[PDB]
Each structure stands twice: as structure tokens, then as C-alpha cells.
Write a protein that binds this ligand. Structure first.
Ligand SMILES: [Zn+2]
Length: 97
């Protein structure tokens, strides 16, 4: 069991994509998927679903990534999974494969 992660590298790359990520990704849509991957907390699910309209989405996903970094690279893998599942063309941009 290690103290902290070095995945600040992984999530600072997503900052370079944040302008697209926070616009295209539905954070409230994938809340049970992120908890299934054990990268989202029950309290944070309640706080993301607190917006029924999701017109504030471009703030919501940005604050979501802040919380997901704290699960290390596992949040980043479950992130790329949610992209590969729901948004194929966005996934190809973010991973760049
Ligand atoms: Zn990493």
C-alpha cells in the first residue's frame, strides 16, 4: 500500500482536453458505471445528480475529474472505458491511438 499517486501526469493531460471533455461527457449519466468501477463515491453521485438540467455540465465534469484523480490511474482507466463505451470518436481524440 503506497501513500500518494504520481497520476498528476495522467490527469494534467486531460486538462489539455477539458474544453471538449466537460462539453461532450454526461457526468450524471455514467454515475452507476463509475461507482461500479469503484472510482466515484455515493456522496459525490448525489452531488453530481443534484443538477437535473445539466446546463452546468461544463463545470460538473471538471469538478468530477478533480475527485477521480484521488483514485489514481484506476479513475483514468474507468474514464477511458466510459469514453470507449459511450463516445467512440471522443475516445480516439483523448487516448490518441
Ligand atoms: Zn497514471
Amino acid at each position: 500500500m503506497s501513500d500518494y499517486e504520481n497520476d498528476d501526469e495522467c490527469w494534467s493531460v486531460l486538462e489539455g482536453f477539458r474544453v471538449t471533455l466537460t462539453s461532450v461527457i454526461d457526468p450524471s449519466r455514467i454515475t452507476p458505471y463509475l461507482r461500479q468501477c469503484k472510482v466515484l463515491n455515493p456522496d459525490d453521485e448525489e452531488q453530481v445528480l443534484s443538477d437535473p438540467n445539466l446546463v452546468i455540465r461544463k463545470r460538473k465534469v471538471g469538478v468530477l475529474l478533480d475527485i477521480l484523480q484521488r483514485t489514481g490511474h484506476k479513475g483514468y482507466v474507468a474514464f477511458l472505458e466510459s469514453l470507449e463505451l459511450y463516445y467512440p470518436q471522443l475516445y480516439k481524440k483523448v487516448t490518441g491511438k
